[PDB]
C-alpha cells in the first residue's frame, strides 16, 4: 500500500524524507503557534484553503490518540505494559504527526514553492560533509 | 482546541451522535468499497474536493493505528492487557473512524444535501419512542429497488 | 391567566391534546438538536420570527430552573425532599417545556401547516381502536421512503 | 314518515353501516375533537355550513341524554334499573351518536368527496380474506 | 361547550324566556301541524335552511327517546321509577323541545321579523300588571 | 343446452374455472356491499346495463334458494337429509352464486378489461408450481391505491 | 326485500298475480320452443335485447334446479323426505321459473305492449261471473 | 431431417431448455385455456398466423396420442406394460407438448419479444445460488399490478 | 374441440375421405421427397408459407411417434402386445399422416387449387364405370 | 449554550446589571399594570412585535413558578427547607423576572431606545456624587 | 509485465473483488448460455464487437485446460496426483474463468454501463447491514 | 461448441497445418519480443486492433497455466506426474500458444495479407521433393 498526501501538494515522502530525522520543533509548539496565528481560520465552517481540511482531522487525530495515551497509562495494571506503550506513542508515529503538521504550518505561512526550496536547499546543505559546509543550517524565513 | 471536523461540511457530532452503531459497516468495509472504487480519483495529484483529501488523511491515521495495534500485539506479554488495548482501538477510535469514513461515502455518492436530508429524518425518527414509532427504517441507496 | 403561547401560532394546547404523554422525546434530544442546528440563528441578533424568540425564552427558563435543580442538590440536606422536588420538576414541567420546544422546533424546519396536517393526521390514527389501525403511525419527514 | 339525517347528504344508513361497529372511535374523543377544531365555529352567530347546525343539535340532544342519565344515577333506588339504564343509554344510542358525529366531523374536515370514498375500499376491504387483499387497512388521512 | 343555538338564528333562550311555559302548545299537536305543512320538504334531499335541518335532527331525538319509552315500558315493573322517568322527560326535555320546535316553525311560517317582533311585544304585554295589560294577549296572524 | 353465460361479455366458465376457491366472499358480504352500494340502481326499472339485470335475477334466484333451505331446515324430521341437502346447497352451488356476483361486481366497478386483465393475470401466476410461484399474489381491489405498503 | 324483476319491463307482480296458477303451461314445452325458435340467439356474444340475457340465466337456474333435484333424488335414503323434496321443485318455486319464462316469451315473441294489454284482457275477462263471461278467453296471436 | 420447430420464431429448443423441467403447467390446463382464449381463432378457417396453425397440429396429434392410449389400455390384456405404455407416454412426449403448448400461448398473447425477456430474465434469475437470488421471480403479466 | 387443419386450407377431411387408401404412398416415400427437395427451405429461420411450418410440426410429431415405436419394440417383453401396438400406430394413424403429407407437398409442388382439381378429377374417374372412363387414369404431373 | 435576550433588541445584560437592583416595583405591581393595560393584546392571536412574545413566555414561567411553589408549601412537611426554598427562587430568579418584565413593558410603552437612554443616563447620574448634579434622581415618564 | 483485461473495458480485476465467490454461477451454465445465445456469433467469421474475440479465446483456453484435466486423469496411476490437479484447476482457474465469461456475456447482453453500475450497487448492498439495506438483491434484467 | 478463431482472421488451421512442427521459435522468443515492441500498446486501454486483445487473452491463459504447473509441481513429491506434465503442457498446447502468438505477431507486424501470401508461398515451396526445391527457403521481411 502506497499513499502519499503530499502528492497532491506537489512534493513526496522520500523528498521530505532528505530532511533527517529529530529536529523538528515539539508538536506541542505546533499546536499552540497554530491556535496563536490560526485559531479564527480552524474555526471558520467555510473551506477556505486545501491545508486547512488536512490540518483539522490530523489535529483530531493527534487529540484522540493523546487520549488513548492517557487512558491506558491510567488505566493498565502493570508497569512494563504501561510505559512501553506510553513510550511507544510518543516514539516513532509522534514523528509522523509532527512532521505533517510542521509541513501543513510552513506551506500555509509561506507558500508550497518556499517550502519546496527550502528542503532542496536543506538537502544539499546536509549532503555535503561538515568539514566543508557552513555550520549555519538554512533558516526558514522571508 | 475546541473543533467540529464535520463542521466545514454543515454537519456536527452532535447531529450524527443520533446515529446508533449498527448503521455503520465495519471499518475494513469501508477500507475495501474506498479501494475499488475511487482510488484513480484518490492517488490523482489534484485535489478535487475536501472529502478526498479527509478521507485520504482518514485512511493514513487508521493505517497508522492498525500498525500500532499489530505492533502491540506482537511484543505484549500480559494477555490482558493486550487483549484489553486492542478491543479499546477496535471499540472506541473504530466507531469515530467508521463514522467518519461512512459520511465521507454517503456525502460524495449521493450529495451533501440528500446526505443532511436523511440525516434529520432519520434524528426525527429515532427520537420516537416504538410504540408510535413505525417499524420500517429509512433507506437511502443507490438502488432503484423498491 | 388564561394565555396559550401556541393560541397566536394557529394552534391551542387542547389541538396539542392529541398527542399522549410518554410520546415526546427527552428534553436532551432536542436541546442536542436545537443547539446543533440553529446555533448561529439562536445567537444571532436579529428576530427572524417569533419561533426563535420562544426557543431562546424557553432555553433560559429551563437553563434556570437546572441551575435551581442542581442547588437544591447540593445545599439542602432532606434526602427525600430533594429527591420529590427534583423528580417533580424534572417529570411535571419539564413534559410542558419539552412539548413547547418540540412543538416550535418542528414548526420551524417542517412548516407550521404541515405541523397542524400532522397533528390531525395523528388524531385520527391515535383515535381509531388497534384492532384496525396500521403499524404505520404518521411521521413528518421532508424525505421519501 | 321515514327520516334519515344522513339523506341530505349522499350517504344513507345502510350504506354507513357498512362499516362495522367498534371502528368509530369513542365519544368523548368525538367530542374533544370537535371542540379543540370548531369552537369558534360553534359558537359563531353565523351558519357558514349546515354541517354545524347538525352538529349544534348533536350536541345538544347528547347533552340532554347526559343530563338524563346523571339525575337517574342521582336520584332512583334500585341499583338494577340504574345499571339497565345507563348501561343502555352508553351503548345502544351512543353507537348511533358516534356514528353521526364521525361522519360530520369527517366530511367537515376532509369534504364529502373523501368521506363517501372512505365508506368504500372500507367494509369492502373488511369482507376480502386476509389473503389477497392489501396488507394494510385503509386510513382516512390528512 | 356553552351553546346557544338560538344565537345562529340571532335570538337567545334569555330572551326566548319571555314566553311562559303553559303557554306552548302539545309536542304532539306541533308535530301534526309541521308535518302537515312541510312533510316532502323534510323528507327531500333539498336542504333551504338550517330550520329543515334542525327540525329534522329534534323529529330524530324524540323518536329516540320514544323508543327508550317503549323499552323501558315493556322491561321494568316497578310504577315509580317508570312514571318518574316519564315526568322527567315530559318535563325538562318536554318544555325545551316544544319551545325549540314553535319557534323554528312559526319563524318558517311567517319569518324571523315578525316573530322576533312578538316576542318583543308579548314580553312588554306581560311585563305590565293585570290592571293595566289589555284583555287581548297579543296574537301573530295573517 | 350449451349455454355460456359469461360468454355474453367475453368470458368462459372453464376460465373463471381458474380462480381458487376460498377466494370469493361469502355470499352474504357480496349481497351486504351489492345493496349497500347500488340500491337505486338495482331498484332502478331502467335496463341501465346487462349487469344490473344480471345482478337482479341472481339475487331473485338465491333468494328463492334460501326459502328452499329454510323450508327443508325447518319441517323435514331426518337429520341426515337435513344436514346433507343444506351442506349441498351452502357448497357446490352457492360457490357459482359468489363466483357471478363477484366477477359481476368486479367488472361494474373496476371495468370489464380491466377484470379480464387480472383474470389472465391469476390464469398464468396461480398456473406456476409454488416453487416458482412468488408469494405475493395479483391484488386487484386498486380502490384502496394499496393504503400504503408493508413488508 | 322485494324486488320484481318484472319491475324493469313495465309490468309489477302485482297485476302479474292476476293469471291463476296452472296458467303456465309446463317448463318443458316452454324449453322445448324456446330451443325451437330462438335458441341459437342465445349464443350471440351480443345481448340484442334484455330479454335474451335474463332468459339465459332463467335456464341454467332451472337447469341448477333440475340437478339437485336428481341428485338429491339419487342419494337420500328415507323415501319421505326425498319424495317431499322432488314435491317441493315443482310445487312453489318451479312455479315462479315458468313464470318469469312465460313473460320473457311472450314479450320477445309478439312484443312488450301486446303483453301488456293481454295481461288487461285477461284481468277484465276473469272478474266478470262465469254465468256472463264469454267461453272464449282472450289468447296472444299473429 | 434435423428440424428445430421454435427456430422461425427466434427461440430454440436447447434455448427453451433453461427453463427448469416440471415448471410448465400441466397439459390439460393449458388445453382448456387455449380453449376458452381462442376457440373462435383456432376454428377459424383463416390461417391468420403460424402460431394458430402450429397449435392446431400440435393439439392434433396429442389427442391423436390421447386417443391411441386410451385404445390399448382397453384393448391389451397384461396392466403392467399397459400402465408402462401410458406413464411414458403421458411424461416424455407430454412434456414436449407442454413446452410447445406454452411456448405458443404465452408468445400469442404477449408477444415473441416479451416471451424472449422473459425467457433471459428466468436464465439469469435461475443461474443465481438461492442463498443470493431473491424469492421474487419474474412473471409476464400484461397486469402492472407490481 | 372440433378441429380440422384442412379447414384453414379450403378443404376437408370428408372431401379427402373420397379419395381410397391403398393409393397413398408411404410415409417414407414422402419423407425423402421432402428432404431432397426442400431440405434448405425446411431447415431455413424464415416461416416463407403456412405450408412449411404446417409440415414441420406433422415431421416433429411423426418422429416422436417413431421414437415411440422403437422404444417399445426395444423395451417391452410381450411379443404379441408389441407386435400388436406396432401394426397398430403403423397402419392406423399411418394413414392419416400420408393424406397430410400427400396434400400439403402437392399443393405446395403445384398449388392448392390444381390439387383440389386433381382430387374432384380423380374421385369422378374412379366413381365412374370401366365401360366410359378414359381408357387412361389421371395423373398428376409438372 | 449561554443566552443574552436582550442583545437582539440592542442592550446586553452587563448594561442592564450595571443598575442598581431593588429598583424596579415589586412583581405584582409589574402582573397587575401589564393585565390591566394589555389584556385584549396578549390575548390576541396577533404577535405584533417579539416583546408579546417575550412577555407570554415569561408569564408562562411566573405561573410555573407560583404553582410549584404552591405545592411545595402544601404538600412538603418540614417549615424550614419550604421556607428557605421560597426565599431562594424569590430573591434569586424573581431579580431576573422582574427586570425582563419591567423593561419590556417599558420599552413596549415608551420606547426602545428611550429606555436604553433612560438606562444608561441614570446609571451615570447614581454614581456621579452630588456635585454638578441636581438633587432629584431621574424619573421614566410620557 | 501487468496485464489486466478489464481494464481495457475500463474496469479492474480488484474492481471484481466486490462480488463474493459464491455468487458466480457454475462453469457449464455459463458456456451452455453463451452457446445457445451467441452460437453463430461465435462461429462467425466477422469481429462485430471485442468482447466476442475476447469471450472467444476464454473458451479455447478453457477448452485447453478441459483437455489437460481428462488427459492427466485417465493416464496417470496415482490418484492423489491427478484427483487435486484436476480439482485445483476446476476450483481456483475456475473462479477466475467463470467471472471473467459471466462479465463478457452480461457486458455483451446488457451493455458495459449496466453491468458496472449491477456491480456497484450489489456491492453497496452486501456492505451495508440488514437493517439500513433493501432486502431484495439486486437484479439485472432487461 | 468448436471455434476456429484464425476464421475471424480470414486463415484456418487447415491453412496453418502447412506449417509443420518443430518451425515456430521458442515460447520466450515471442513473448519477449512481442513484449518490447508493444508494451506500451498492450498495456494501453484502448482496444486498437482485435489482434492486441487476443495476444492480451493468450498471454493470460498461458501465464496462468504456467503458475498453476509450477505451483503444483513445487508441492507434489512425486517426479512422474512433476516432469511428464511438464514435458506436455510445454510440448503441445505449449506449441499451440506459440503458433497462435506468432500468428498474431506477424500478421500485426508486416500485415494480414502478406503473411497470407507468406504461407501461400511457403506451402508451395514445401509441397516440391527436395531433389528440386531450392535451399533458400522463403522468407518474410522488408
Redesign the interface.
Known amino acids: 500500500?502506497d499513499?502519499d498526501?503530499y502528492?497532491?501538494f506537489?512534493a513526496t515522502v522520500e523528498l521530505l524524507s532528505f530532511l533527517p530525522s529529530d529536529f523538528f520543533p515539539s508538536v506541542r509548539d505546533l499546536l499552540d503557534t497554530a491556535?496563536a496565528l490560526y485559531?479564527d481560520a480552524?474555526?471558520?465552517?467555510?473551506?477556505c484553503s486545501?491545508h486547512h481540511?488536512?490540518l483539522?482531522?490530523?489535529?483530531?487525530?493527534w487529540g484522540?490518540?493523546m487520549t488513548?495515551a492517557t487512558?491506558?497509562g491510567t488505566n493498565?495494571?502493570?508497569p512494563?505494559?504501561r510505559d512501553?506503550?506510553v513510550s511507544?506513542?510518543n516514539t516513532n508515529?509522534g514523528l509522523?504527526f509532527r512532521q505533517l503538521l510542521w509541513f501543513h504550518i510552513s506551506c500555509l505561512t509561506f507558500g508550497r514553492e518556499t517550502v519546496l526550496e527550502y528542503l532542496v536547499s536543506f538537502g544539499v546543505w546536509i549532503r555535503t560533509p561538515p568539514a566543508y559546509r557552513p555550520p549555519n543550517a538554512p533558516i526558514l524565513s522571508t
Chains 1, 4, 5, 7, 9, 10, 11, 12 share one sequence.
Open positions: 500500500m499513499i498526501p502528492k497532491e506537489g491556535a485559531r480552524l474555526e471558520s465552517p467555510e473551506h486545501p481540511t488536512a483539522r482531522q490530523a489535529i483530531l487525530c484522540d490518540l488513548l487512558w491506558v493498565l495494571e502493570d512494563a505494559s512501553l506503550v511507544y506513542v508515529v509522523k
